[PDB]
Amino acid sequence: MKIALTNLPPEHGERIARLLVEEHIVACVNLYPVHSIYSWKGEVCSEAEVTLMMKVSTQGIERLKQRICELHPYELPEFVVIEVDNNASLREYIDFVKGETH
Amino acid sequence: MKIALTNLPPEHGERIARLLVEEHIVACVNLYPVHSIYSWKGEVCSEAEVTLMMKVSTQGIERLKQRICELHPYELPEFVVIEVDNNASLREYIDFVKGETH
Amino acid sequence: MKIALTNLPPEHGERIARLLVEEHIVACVNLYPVHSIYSWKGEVCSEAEVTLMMKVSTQGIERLKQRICELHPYELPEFVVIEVDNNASLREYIDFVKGETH
Amino acid sequence: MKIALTNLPPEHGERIARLLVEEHIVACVNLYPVHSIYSWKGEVCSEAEVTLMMKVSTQGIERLKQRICELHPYELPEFVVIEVDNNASLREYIDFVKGETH
Amino acid sequence: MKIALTNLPPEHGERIARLLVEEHIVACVNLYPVHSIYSWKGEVCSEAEVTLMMKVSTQGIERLKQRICELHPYELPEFVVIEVDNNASLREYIDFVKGETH
Amino acid sequence: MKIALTNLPPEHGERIARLLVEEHIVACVNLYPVHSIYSWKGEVCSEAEVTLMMKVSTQGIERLKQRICELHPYELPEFVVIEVDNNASLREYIDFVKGETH
């Protein structure tokens, strides 16, 4: 399995997280609000966002990336994938994540 | 060192995080609330949870996993381990984490 | 690219996050509050902190570590670097992070 | 002006807040996530919710109540009006809140 | 009804809230984490706390105050009652709050 | 005592709160992040802000208002005073709030 992150305006975060679970593209999402500061086209931007921490099988990652890009309101969305130490994690939890990712 | 994640109902999060530090199974825990959406036995579940981001030596991970499973109220708890780039991290901070993990 | 974490008292979190983006040492920071429990010099410490989740090019990490250490109010600050699965992430987002990291 | 409070599931909180601002039923809304513990039909319930702290003109309250009852997903919604000390508050802020409310 | 506020250390906030709901001393509690900055014995204090926003019937307030003073870990606890506009609030919500309070 | 509310950009919320406590203009401040949706000059605005829930003595309110207007970065700042039921609240807490306010 892996963890994937994106950030969404709070309008869309929950909607999109819900869809991803309904469509079984991810097993589980944690959402929490966040304050983002970034450089964009020569300016320091400060925004209210929600982070989606998404739990998906390692092979379901490509499909997730595709879907995020379809649904995401930003020209250039964040999609950052983090590697999980699968063998140090709880075996039955990874198996669960794999099972719910169709 | 590594980072480990679990999610707990807010009732147990703080209690369990406190124990793990008192028993020196982890060096440090960050707790923050989270909204979780996941698939479970054919249903979309939506819950209030607290994420525990736990900082532990690389070899203390097995013991942490065992302890989490003993204390965790869920049939199938989340326990996800994330690999840390140890050499790009601050050396003295990893040494601290190692030292507090007995 | 990589993700880097530190935790700061809420007094300094925002200030420091802002500087790092203005100085183009990181592309983007997400800040969120956190409750931290850790062992320090024989005692269980409980504090209000803010987590800075920082997005930086893989080679800009050394400079970030140096800067964090210059600005951070703690004797021993947290600086934890997490490896990103660059090829499973969105290519154009990594390119963006690289571009904003001077 | 007055402050009104409601709690919504995260899936509806942001959507509904947005609408109330756009329709000029409230001047401003502050949303923040919350863990709700409540008694309901003989069960202790524990939910992820988002609080909407709404700023509205005194004369706009009944419309807000009406609209909240229309849009709210719950059978029995929360609508709680908090008493503002209008003389002690800042005049220009109250005026702003009056001017954005219809 | 009225709203009552207190702040607790995270280790006690969730436990205490749960009790007050179970004992039917409050109908509902919303908890959310908070950073507290306060003056105490000549020191500026900075703490992680969790706010409990409690819904109780008017006649239930003194019991709530009494129970808060019994359970609260602090020498001098916070107990602040906020004035609800009962006529402008939703009747059925107030009634619900009355019915869950003893 | 009374409760006063304002909202600030995250870059100023913590700094300003700290000052008001140090100068003994408020006894205590609770800060928490918030997503603000508000109407402003014909635009629906969506911002990251931090709420300051401030505890002050009744006679200290005007100074607090004055100081908030001085320090606040916004042209038109939020300053909203919430009505506390002083008899129903805990006497010793009110007294503490009076004693820390000048």
Side-chain angles (χ1 to χ4, degrees), chain A residues 1-40 42-97 99-102, chain B residues 1-40 42-97 99-102, chain C residues 1-40 42-97 99-102, chain D residues 1 3-90 92-97 99-102, chain E residues 1 3-90 92-97 99-102, chain F residues 1 3-90 92-97 99-102:
Chain A
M1 80 165 273
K2 291 222 207 86
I3 288 166
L5 306 178
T6 186
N7 275 298
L8 284 161
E11 201 187 344
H12 299 289
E14 286 284 339
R15 178 178 72 88
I16 289 176
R18 172 163 30 88
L19 287 181
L20 297 172
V21 173
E22 287 173 327
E23 298 177 2
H24 293 280
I25 290 169
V26 304
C28 167
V29 193
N30 302 139
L31 297 97
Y32 52 96
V34 124
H35 175 212
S36 305
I37 316 180
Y38 58 84
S39 291
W40 180 247
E43 271 192 345
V44 183
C45 296
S46 177
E47 308 291 352
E49 292 187 308
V50 66
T51 288
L52 276 65
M53 197 172 81
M54 295 167 288
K55 277 101 186 218
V56 67
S57 71
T58 290
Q59 70 210 142
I61 275 283
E62 196 55 33
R63 183 152 175 268
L64 174 56
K65 169 158 86 185
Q66 199 191 178
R67 198 80 183 96
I68 288 293
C69 290
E70 281 162 3
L71 293 173
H72 213 292
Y74 296 166
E75 283 178 332
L76 172 48
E78 181 183 332
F79 184 78
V80 172
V81 179
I82 294 163
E83 243 175 310
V84 169
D85 181 342
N86 284 284
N87 275 313
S89 298
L90 187 67
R91 180 77 251 157
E92 31 275 77
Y93 186 74
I94 292 160
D95 293 352
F96 157 80
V97 170
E100 296 302 332
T101 312
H102 300 171
Chain B
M1 80 165 273
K2 291 222 207 86
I3 288 166
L5 306 178
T6 186
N7 275 298
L8 284 161
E11 201 187 344
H12 299 289
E14 286 284 339
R15 178 178 72 88
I16 289 176
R18 172 163 30 88
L19 287 181
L20 297 172
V21 173
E22 287 173 327
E23 298 177 2
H24 293 280
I25 290 169
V26 304
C28 167
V29 193
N30 302 139
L31 297 97
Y32 52 96
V34 124
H35 175 212
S36 305
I37 316 180
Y38 58 84
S39 291
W40 180 247
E43 271 192 345
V44 183
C45 296
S46 177
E47 308 291 352
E49 292 187 308
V50 66
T51 288
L52 276 65
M53 197 172 81
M54 295 167 288
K55 277 101 186 218
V56 67
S57 71
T58 290
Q59 70 210 142
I61 275 283
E62 196 55 33
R63 183 152 175 268
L64 174 56
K65 169 158 86 185
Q66 199 191 178
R67 198 80 183 96
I68 288 293
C69 290
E70 281 162 3
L71 293 173
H72 213 292
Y74 296 166
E75 283 178 332
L76 172 48
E78 181 183 332
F79 184 78
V80 172
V81 179
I82 294 163
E83 243 175 310
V84 169
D85 181 342
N86 284 284
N87 275 313
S89 298
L90 187 67
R91 180 77 251 157
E92 31 275 77
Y93 186 74
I94 292 160
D95 293 352
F96 157 80
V97 170
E100 296 302 332
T101 312
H102 300 171
Chain C
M1 80 165 273
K2 291 222 207 86
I3 288 166
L5 306 178
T6 186
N7 275 298
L8 284 161
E11 201 187 344
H12 299 289
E14 286 284 339
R15 178 178 72 88
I16 289 176
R18 172 163 30 88
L19 287 181
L20 297 172
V21 173
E22 287 173 327
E23 298 177 2
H24 293 280
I25 290 169
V26 304
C28 167
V29 193
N30 302 139
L31 297 97
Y32 52 96
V34 124
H35 175 212
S36 305
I37 316 180
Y38 58 84
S39 291
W40 180 247
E43 271 192 345
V44 183
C45 296
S46 177
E47 308 291 352
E49 292 187 308
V50 66
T51 288
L52 276 65
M53 197 172 81
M54 295 167 288
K55 277 101 186 218
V56 67
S57 71
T58 290
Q59 70 210 142
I61 275 283
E62 196 55 33
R63 183 152 175 268
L64 174 56
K65 169 158 86 185
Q66 199 191 178
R67 198 80 183 96
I68 288 293
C69 290
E70 281 162 3
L71 293 173
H72 213 292
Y74 296 166
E75 283 178 332
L76 172 48
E78 181 183 332
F79 184 78
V80 172
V81 179
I82 294 163
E83 243 175 310
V84 169
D85 181 342
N86 284 284
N87 275 313
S89 298
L90 187 67
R91 180 77 251 157
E92 31 275 77
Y93 186 74
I94 292 160
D95 293 352
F96 157 80
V97 170
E100 296 302 332
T101 312
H102 300 171
Chain D
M1 64 165 301
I3 291 167
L5 296 176
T6 188
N7 280 345
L8 285 159
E11 38 167 9
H12 298 300
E14 284 286 339
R15 178 182 65 87
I16 288 173
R18 181 96 195 182
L19 283 183
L20 293 173
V21 174
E22 277 168 23
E23 295 178 2
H24 284 274
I25 293 178
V26 301
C28 174
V29 182
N30 300 145
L31 298 91
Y32 54 90
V34 127
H35 172 220
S36 309
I37 303 180
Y38 60 93
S39 188
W40 186 249
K41 309 190 172 196
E43 296 280 339
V44 177
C45 297
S46 168
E47 297 296 302
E49 291 190 328
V50 51
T51 290
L52 279 61
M53 190 181 87
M54 301 166 282
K55 281 99 189 208
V56 61
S57 65
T58 308
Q59 66 217 125
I61 277 282
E62 181 49 56
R63 204 206 191 179
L64 174 58
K65 183 150 84 164
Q66 191 184 72
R67 196 76 181 112
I68 289 290
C69 288
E70 286 166 8
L71 297 163
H72 213 284
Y74 298 167
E75 271 185 303
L76 192 158
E78 178 164 359
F79 188 72
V80 175
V81 177
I82 272 162
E83 300 266 17
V84 170
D85 186 332
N86 289 280
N87 290 341
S89 310
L90 187 65
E92 31 272 285
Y93 187 69
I94 292 173
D95 289 348
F96 153 78
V97 168
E100 300 306 324
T101 308
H102 286 215
Chain E
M1 64 165 301
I3 291 167
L5 296 176
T6 188
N7 280 345
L8 285 159
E11 38 167 9
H12 298 300
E14 284 286 339
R15 178 182 65 87
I16 288 173
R18 181 96 195 182
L19 283 183
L20 293 173
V21 174
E22 277 168 23
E23 295 178 2
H24 284 274
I25 293 178
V26 301
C28 174
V29 182
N30 300 145
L31 298 91
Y32 54 90
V34 127
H35 172 220
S36 309
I37 303 180
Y38 60 93
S39 188
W40 186 249
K41 309 190 172 196
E43 296 280 339
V44 177
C45 297
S46 168
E47 297 296 302
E49 291 190 328
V50 51
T51 290
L52 279 61
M53 190 181 87
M54 301 166 282
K55 281 99 189 208
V56 61
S57 65
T58 308
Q59 66 217 125
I61 277 282
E62 181 49 56
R63 204 206 191 179
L64 174 58
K65 183 150 84 164
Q66 191 184 72
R67 196 76 181 112
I68 289 290
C69 288
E70 286 166 8
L71 297 163
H72 213 284
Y74 298 167
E75 271 185 303
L76 192 158
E78 178 164 359
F79 188 72
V80 175
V81 177
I82 272 162
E83 300 266 17
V84 170
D85 186 332
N86 289 280
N87 290 341
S89 310
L90 187 65
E92 31 272 285
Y93 187 69
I94 292 173
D95 289 348
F96 153 77
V97 168
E100 300 306 324
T101 308
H102 286 215
Chain F
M1 64 165 301
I3 291 167
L5 296 176
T6 188
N7 280 345
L8 285 159
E11 38 167 9
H12 298 300
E14 284 286 339
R15 178 182 65 87
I16 288 173
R18 181 96 195 182
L19 283 183
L20 293 173
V21 174
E22 277 168 23
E23 295 178 2
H24 284 274
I25 293 178
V26 301
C28 174
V29 182
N30 300 145
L31 298 91
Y32 54 90
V34 127
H35 172 220
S36 309
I37 303 180
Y38 60 93
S39 188
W40 186 249
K41 309 190 172 196
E43 296 280 339
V44 177
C45 297
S46 168
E47 297 296 302
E49 291 190 328
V50 51
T51 290
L52 279 61
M53 190 181 87
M54 301 166 282
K55 281 99 189 208
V56 61
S57 65
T58 308
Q59 66 217 125
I61 277 282
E62 181 49 56
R63 204 206 191 179
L64 174 58
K65 183 150 84 164
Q66 191 184 72
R67 196 76 181 112
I68 289 290
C69 288
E70 286 166 8
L71 297 163
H72 213 284
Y74 298 167
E75 271 185 303
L76 192 158
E78 178 164 359
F79 188 72
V80 175
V81 177
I82 272 162
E83 300 266 17
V84 170
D85 186 332
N86 289 280
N87 290 341
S89 310
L90 187 65
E92 31 272 285
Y93 187 69
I94 292 173
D95 289 348
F96 153 78
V97 168
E100 300 306 324
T101 308
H102 286 215

PDB file of all heavy atoms in Angstrom, chain E residues 11-24:
ATOM      1  N   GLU E  11      -5.950  15.156  27.586  1.00  0.00           N
ATOM      2  CA  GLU E  11      -6.113  13.920  28.369  1.00  0.00           C
ATOM      3  C   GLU E  11      -7.414  13.799  29.166  1.00  0.00           C
ATOM      4  O   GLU E  11      -7.795  12.690  29.530  1.00  0.00           O
ATOM      5  CB  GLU E  11      -4.934  13.728  29.339  1.00  0.00           C
ATOM      6  CG  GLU E  11      -4.419  15.012  29.980  1.00  0.00           C
ATOM      7  CD  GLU E  11      -3.466  14.797  31.155  1.00  0.00           C
ATOM      8  OE1 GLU E  11      -3.019  13.642  31.434  1.00  0.00           O
ATOM      9  OE2 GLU E  11      -3.153  15.828  31.799  1.00  0.00           O
ATOM     10  N   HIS E  12      -8.075  14.914  29.468  1.00  0.00           N
ATOM     11  CA  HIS E  12      -9.318  14.878  30.229  1.00  0.00           C
ATOM     12  C   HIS E  12     -10.548  15.357  29.464  1.00  0.00           C
ATOM     13  O   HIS E  12     -11.668  15.020  29.827  1.00  0.00           O
ATOM     14  CB  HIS E  12      -9.157  15.700  31.507  1.00  0.00           C
ATOM     15  CG  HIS E  12      -8.107  15.169  32.430  1.00  0.00           C
ATOM     16  ND1 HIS E  12      -8.162  13.902  32.966  1.00  0.00           N
ATOM     17  CD2 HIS E  12      -6.972  15.728  32.905  1.00  0.00           C
ATOM     18  CE1 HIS E  12      -7.104  13.702  33.729  1.00  0.00           C
ATOM     19  NE2 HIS E  12      -6.372  14.799  33.717  1.00  0.00           N
ATOM     20  N   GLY E  13     -10.355  16.144  28.418  1.00  0.00           N
ATOM     21  CA  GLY E  13     -11.478  16.760  27.717  1.00  0.00           C
ATOM     22  C   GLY E  13     -12.488  15.740  27.219  1.00  0.00           C
ATOM     23  O   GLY E  13     -13.685  15.852  27.493  1.00  0.00           O
ATOM     24  N   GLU E  14     -11.996  14.742  26.492  1.00  0.00           N
ATOM     25  CA  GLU E  14     -12.856  13.736  25.884  1.00  0.00           C
ATOM     26  C   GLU E  14     -13.528  12.859  26.937  1.00  0.00           C
ATOM     27  O   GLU E  14     -14.734  12.635  26.856  1.00  0.00           O
ATOM     28  CB  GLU E  14     -12.089  12.890  24.869  1.00  0.00           C
ATOM     29  CG  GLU E  14     -11.840  13.595  23.543  1.00  0.00           C
ATOM     30  CD  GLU E  14     -13.080  13.716  22.670  1.00  0.00           C
ATOM     31  OE1 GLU E  14     -14.039  12.930  22.879  1.00  0.00           O
ATOM     32  OE2 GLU E  14     -13.091  14.585  21.746  1.00  0.00           O
ATOM     33  N   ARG E  15     -12.756  12.406  27.929  1.00  0.00           N
ATOM     34  CA  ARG E  15     -13.281  11.604  29.042  1.00  0.00           C
ATOM     35  C   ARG E  15     -14.405  12.347  29.755  1.00  0.00           C
ATOM     36  O   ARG E  15     -15.511  11.827  29.895  1.00  0.00           O
ATOM     37  CB  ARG E  15     -12.181  11.208  30.058  1.00  0.00           C
ATOM     38  CG  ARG E  15     -12.701  10.397  31.259  1.00  0.00           C
ATOM     39  CD  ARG E  15     -11.631  10.041  32.294  1.00  0.00           C
ATOM     40  NE  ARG E  15     -11.086  11.231  32.953  1.00  0.00           N
ATOM     41  CZ  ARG E  15     -11.600  11.825  34.029  1.00  0.00           C
ATOM     42  NH1 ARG E  15     -12.690  11.351  34.635  1.00  0.00           N
ATOM     43  NH2 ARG E  15     -11.017  12.913  34.514  1.00  0.00           N
ATOM     44  N   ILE E  16     -14.134  13.566  30.193  1.00  0.00           N
ATOM     45  CA  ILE E  16     -15.145  14.326  30.922  1.00  0.00           C
ATOM     46  C   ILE E  16     -16.410  14.611  30.089  1.00  0.00           C
ATOM     47  O   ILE E  16     -17.525  14.453  30.593  1.00  0.00           O
ATOM     48  CB  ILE E  16     -14.548  15.612  31.526  1.00  0.00           C
ATOM     49  CG1 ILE E  16     -13.644  15.236  32.700  1.00  0.00           C
ATOM     50  CG2 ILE E  16     -15.642  16.565  31.978  1.00  0.00           C
ATOM     51  CD1 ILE E  16     -12.850  16.387  33.280  1.00  0.00           C
ATOM     52  N   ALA E  17     -16.241  15.025  28.831  1.00  0.00           N
ATOM     53  CA  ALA E  17     -17.394  15.290  27.954  1.00  0.00           C
ATOM     54  C   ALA E  17     -18.315  14.078  27.899  1.00  0.00           C
ATOM     55  O   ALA E  17     -19.517  14.180  28.158  1.00  0.00           O
ATOM     56  CB  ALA E  17     -16.933  15.651  26.553  1.00  0.00           C
ATOM     57  N   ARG E  18     -17.717  12.933  27.587  1.00  0.00           N
ATOM     58  CA  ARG E  18     -18.399  11.641  27.537  1.00  0.00           C
ATOM     59  C   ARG E  18     -19.247  11.373  28.788  1.00  0.00           C
ATOM     60  O   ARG E  18     -20.407  10.969  28.691  1.00  0.00           O
ATOM     61  CB  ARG E  18     -17.347  10.538  27.354  1.00  0.00           C
ATOM     62  CG  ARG E  18     -17.892   9.129  27.254  1.00  0.00           C
ATOM     63  CD  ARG E  18     -18.076   8.669  25.823  1.00  0.00           C
ATOM     64  NE  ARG E  18     -18.926   7.479  25.781  1.00  0.00           N
ATOM     65  CZ  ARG E  18     -19.238   6.808  24.678  1.00  0.00           C
ATOM     66  NH1 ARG E  18     -18.769   7.198  23.497  1.00  0.00           N
ATOM     67  NH2 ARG E  18     -20.026   5.737  24.764  1.00  0.00           N
ATOM     68  N   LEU E  19     -18.657  11.593  29.958  1.00  0.00           N
ATOM     69  CA  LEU E  19     -19.358  11.398  31.214  1.00  0.00           C
ATOM     70  C   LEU E  19     -20.600  12.297  31.306  1.00  0.00           C
ATOM     71  O   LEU E  19     -21.687  11.823  31.638  1.00  0.00           O
ATOM     72  CB  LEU E  19     -18.432  11.659  32.410  1.00  0.00           C
ATOM     73  CG  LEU E  19     -17.404  10.600  32.824  1.00  0.00           C
ATOM     74  CD1 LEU E  19     -16.666  11.063  34.078  1.00  0.00           C
ATOM     75  CD2 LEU E  19     -18.041   9.237  33.083  1.00  0.00           C
ATOM     76  N   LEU E  20     -20.436  13.580  31.001  1.00  0.00           N
ATOM     77  CA  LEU E  20     -21.527  14.545  31.145  1.00  0.00           C
ATOM     78  C   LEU E  20     -22.709  14.225  30.248  1.00  0.00           C
ATOM     79  O   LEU E  20     -23.847  14.503  30.613  1.00  0.00           O
ATOM     80  CB  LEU E  20     -21.051  15.969  30.845  1.00  0.00           C
ATOM     81  CG  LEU E  20     -20.044  16.599  31.810  1.00  0.00           C
ATOM     82  CD1 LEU E  20     -19.583  17.924  31.236  1.00  0.00           C
ATOM     83  CD2 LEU E  20     -20.607  16.808  33.201  1.00  0.00           C
ATOM     84  N   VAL E  21     -22.437  13.650  29.080  1.00  0.00           N
ATOM     85  CA  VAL E  21     -23.490  13.202  28.175  1.00  0.00           C
ATOM     86  C   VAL E  21     -24.197  11.970  28.719  1.00  0.00           C
ATOM     87  O   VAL E  21     -25.429  11.951  28.785  1.00  0.00           O
ATOM     88  CB  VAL E  21     -22.949  12.910  26.766  1.00  0.00           C
ATOM     89  CG1 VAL E  21     -24.035  12.307  25.885  1.00  0.00           C
ATOM     90  CG2 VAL E  21     -22.415  14.192  26.128  1.00  0.00           C
ATOM     91  N   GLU E  22     -23.411  10.961  29.109  1.00  0.00           N
ATOM     92  CA  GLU E  22     -23.918   9.703  29.701  1.00  0.00           C
ATOM     93  C   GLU E  22     -24.784   9.904  30.934  1.00  0.00           C
ATOM     94  O   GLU E  22     -25.784   9.214  31.095  1.00  0.00           O
ATOM     95  CB  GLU E  22     -22.761   8.777  30.106  1.00  0.00           C
ATOM     96  CG  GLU E  22     -22.184   7.938  28.981  1.00  0.00           C
ATOM     97  CD  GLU E  22     -20.877   7.260  29.364  1.00  0.00           C
ATOM     98  OE1 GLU E  22     -20.639   7.063  30.579  1.00  0.00           O
ATOM     99  OE2 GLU E  22     -20.087   6.933  28.448  1.00  0.00           O
ATOM    100  N   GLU E  23     -24.368  10.815  31.818  1.00  0.00           N
ATOM    101  CA  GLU E  23     -25.105  11.115  33.066  1.00  0.00           C
ATOM    102  C   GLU E  23     -26.308  12.028  32.803  1.00  0.00           C
ATOM    103  O   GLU E  23     -27.038  12.359  33.727  1.00  0.00           O
ATOM    104  CB  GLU E  23     -24.181  11.772  34.115  1.00  0.00           C
ATOM    105  CG  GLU E  23     -23.056  10.873  34.619  1.00  0.00           C
ATOM    106  CD  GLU E  23     -22.110  11.544  35.621  1.00  0.00           C
ATOM    107  OE1 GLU E  23     -22.327  12.718  35.991  1.00  0.00           O
ATOM    108  OE2 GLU E  23     -21.138  10.881  36.058  1.00  0.00           O
ATOM    109  N   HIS E  24     -26.496  12.428  31.543  1.00  0.00           N
ATOM    110  CA  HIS E  24     -27.567  13.339  31.136  1.00  0.00           C
ATOM    111  C   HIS E  24     -27.506  14.670  31.861  1.00  0.00           C
ATOM    112  O   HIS E  24     -28.523  15.205  32.295  1.00  0.00           O
ATOM    113  CB  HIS E  24     -28.941  12.679  31.290  1.00  0.00           C
ATOM    114  CG  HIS E  24     -29.240  11.681  30.218  1.00  0.00           C
ATOM    115  ND1 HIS E  24     -29.796  12.036  29.006  1.00  0.00           N
ATOM    116  CD2 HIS E  24     -29.045  10.345  30.169  1.00  0.00           C
ATOM    117  CE1 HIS E  24     -29.936  10.956  28.259  1.00  0.00           C
ATOM    118  NE2 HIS E  24     -29.494   9.916  28.944  1.00  0.00           N
TER     119      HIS E  24
END
